[PDB]
Design a protein around this ligand. Sequence first.
Ligand SMILES: [Mg+2]
Ligand SMILES: [Mg+2]
Ligand SMILES: [Zn+2]
Ligand SMILES: [Zn+2]
Lengths: 57, 76, 109, 384, 174, 113, 56, 97
Amino acid sequence: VESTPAPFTQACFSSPSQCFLKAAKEGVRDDLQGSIDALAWGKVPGFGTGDQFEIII
Amino acid sequence: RKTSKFMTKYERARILGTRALQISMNAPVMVELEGETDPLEIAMKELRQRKIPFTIRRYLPDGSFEEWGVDELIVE
Amino acid sequence: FRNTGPVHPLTRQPVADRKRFGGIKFGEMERDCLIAHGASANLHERLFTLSDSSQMHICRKCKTYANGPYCRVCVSSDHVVRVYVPYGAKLLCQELFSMGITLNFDTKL
Amino acid sequence: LQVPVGTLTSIGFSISNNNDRDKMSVLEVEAPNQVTDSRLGLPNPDSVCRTCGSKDRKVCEGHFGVINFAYSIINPYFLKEVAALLNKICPGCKYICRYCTLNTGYPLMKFRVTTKEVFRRSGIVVEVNEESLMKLKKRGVLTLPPDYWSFLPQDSNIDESCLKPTRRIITHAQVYALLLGIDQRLIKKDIPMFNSLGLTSFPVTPNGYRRTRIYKKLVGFEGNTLELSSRVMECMQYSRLFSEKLCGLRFMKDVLLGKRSDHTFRTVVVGDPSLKLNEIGIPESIAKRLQVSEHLIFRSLMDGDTVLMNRPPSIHQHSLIAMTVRILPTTSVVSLNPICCLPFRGDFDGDCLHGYVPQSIQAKVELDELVALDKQLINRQNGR
Amino acid sequence: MFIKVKLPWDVTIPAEDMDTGLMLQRAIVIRLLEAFSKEKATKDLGYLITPTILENIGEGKIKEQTGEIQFPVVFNGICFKMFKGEIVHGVVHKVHKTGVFLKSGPYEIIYLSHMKMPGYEFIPGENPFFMNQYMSRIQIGARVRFVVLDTEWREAEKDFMALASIDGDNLGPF
Amino acid sequence: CMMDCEAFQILDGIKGQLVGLSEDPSIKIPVSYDRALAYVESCVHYTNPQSVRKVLEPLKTYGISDGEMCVIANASSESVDEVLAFIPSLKTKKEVINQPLQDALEELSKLKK
Amino acid sequence: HSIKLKHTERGIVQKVVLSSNDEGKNFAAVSLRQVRSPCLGDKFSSMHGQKGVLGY
Amino acid sequence: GNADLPGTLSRRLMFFMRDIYAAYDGTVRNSFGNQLVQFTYETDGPVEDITGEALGSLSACALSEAAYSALDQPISLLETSPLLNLKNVLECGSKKG
DNA sequence: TCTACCGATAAGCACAACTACCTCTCC
RNA sequence: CGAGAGGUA
DNA sequence: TTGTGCTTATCGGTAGA
Ligand SMILES: [Mg+2]
Ligand SMILES: [Mg+2]
Ligand SMILES: [Zn+2]
Ligand SMILES: [Zn+2]
């Protein structure tokens, strides 16, 4: 309903094979917006630490 | 603008960690050191003396961002 | 207690054998509690740095996976970037490729 | 031999086709009698990898190889879409005609996929609607017309089935014949991935990723195209993601969700009111072997260091408490203030606490600023 | 084809020297100086020696990797593209029976094959080989112009090796 | 856009700045300096402003591309039959008469004493 | 080859027993003994469901 | 005897509430598409800095603590069961028709 | 006068039934 | 390497 | 041993032209 695809989190929830097959058939694009998706690919979640950048100069 | 003008705990911790990492890599300290040997103590002194030259860029949900400074923000 | 020890043959993770070196499982509940606390550097170290650190090469002109790295889809390209992902991600990508799913990876830098 | 470093984002999903399969495979071998376990398998009994440098199963990844067939086979994932499309379009008119008018005596036919009920093959079978057949029987028509199945071209791959004159199985070659003449716009709407329909190759998992007998069975060149699809479907279901212990959701939990880390310890905890609330008693025997990383390269654990203590299960965020390490003359046991047992919800009767030792300086800095005991003085559940 | 084409870089700076805000440009210039000195190679661009004009510098992004901060800086420099159809001069270094050496500076090594010059015969009666059959004496130190051919490159060294041909007019020293 | 003259002048500035504060805390490269010293001694000019203006003057009044003008300045031909034999792109054309080209070569020889 | 003791294997050799079956497969058994003095974290129980670990 | 229900409830609630955070604008956003959930946090005591806190995660942790502590209560369909009542309250979409 | 979708109800089939550990004993 | 039974929080 | 979905599918079951 929200038009926000997230195959990785849905697969991690339950039934990963069916979710992956549906995502491949639909050809959806996952932007890794979720925190668990970022953690599974070595990225910061972005809630407490990760939503700001420290620039020296 | 449109900012609370307060430095959060997460930003403070990240700044302290970055400064401690820089100090541990043989970096000169802007603030004078007297009887201090731990990088965390030096970072705390620099943060309390608001003389650390770091800039904070806060990302907004709409896509835009606002750039601040350590001296511009206040601590508590 | 464990400092350094053997890794599991399937996934590059510490073995659950106290006799050899031991290994403590960092479960989902601890990760959720750490997210609630807001410590991201600790969570990044417990899942990628000290758990399984691997590398992956992705072509930039196309969206494929390159094995120095070489891309057989196109000519020998001088623009190939390296991303740092856990070995679990590579294992999942290999599993998806084996079952008949091809993934496209895009790099911002 | 240097490459830049970049971030990863916007992961895409698509079904594998022939182009990507034939372009990603390096030194693919389709010889039935040759396993070719020298350029794609790391744990193979050989000296080094022929496609990369010598390593100890830590610098060489798992190279892929795809076997090559001699013809084209429709992807099993699209069989349902093809069966649905064939049901709507009449197989003798190629429109949205003897099969279109009810006055010609030709009963309506339905296309469906049979699963292990008739010949243990997931194929497309044409079945005559029994309701229409019963109406014809009331009119004296006991058998179907001999030219009822004239729309199916003769195929040499057909064999002895003898199921029934009303039910016939469609070979892979006959499906393409039925698809010929159909408008491209109609076919594209039913099946989006038109390019991935042709499956002429199948990748083989490397020895490093560990399924081999079935792969060696499908590499042999032989006829009976109705069996190749079944073999491909059977070998695809042997993936770890498919449900049947390390399979399906359990595989995800054990690999990506739950992980094991280094620089950790687990011992039994007892009571010691002499220590402070924010201090944890670590024995000298264990702390001496536990090594930490400090910038001057591994020094032993000592006083002042912070460890992340936790008691399973972590039912709330207060189970993670950062405490300062204090060396005690005891051994094989840890001690803490008995008042601090409330956040852990644990007694002293055999309860074991496992802790985590940060290595990077930034993780240590953020550990005692957010996860320390003095920062958790206010309970977040009720404010008390 | 020595067009000064600008090229940005992503040179990183160690945290060992991060001070002197009034004269921090000294650390910036020495950081980019060691950036292209460590590489000192190219595939199809050429070579660079000095960062004459610094166009613009960007915001320094940091990373949690041993205290390193990058610096996106774009500037223009001197280069040279070996385009086909150019008469370039060169100085001979030595002579042998095959693969005559020709150096257009120490930036590249150019080899001359047998099927590049006109009909000549080897002279083994002296120490250095001579090609004075067509009334032209070539020795070490004399500048000889020739037509540049397609250039090749290696994997590690990536040297700008090419082929030298004297098929054009005005051959020999001038 | 440096052929011989302004490429040599910028190297003089490098030599002028090298004598001052030669001690460097970081590493140095001797290959790059060797490439500049052993390549700039091929052909030199007298004056920068007058030479560049006389080279770019035919580029304005006559139609020559940037690539063709760069390769003819490095070769520095002294006749009309030499240029017609070097560049194959200048063969079979009538856009420019050879007599103005001969005058251009005279100007090039005049500026070089 | 030989069998080596692991990280948590120690004791004093008590007896060595050698035996074989009718198939000719030889067997070897080595017993290691050690006195377990009550440590600080040992668990003790009562006759009425009172279980707890040593504290001090 | 009855301990899988609190764990399943906690996992399914965490999978819903872990992506909720508060932004710098004062609104409570979501990780997927910056979806807006609440315009303003309640904050009966508004002297706080919650511009970067994970409110959903701590709410899920509190509800999990409430569910696990209910195990001491009698889990009975005949008399009463606070854990089962909480599970039924938290599960509304399933109960249809 | 003879269907074309729509609805109620078996039915057969799936996924799922908590965490972190330690042991023995066949393979 | 897995599988089967017991136990600890 | 149940708890929810999920897809057939299977008979009617109404209008409806
Ligand atoms: Mg108790
Ligand atoms: Mg207890
Ligand atoms: Zn490519
Ligand atoms: Zn290899």
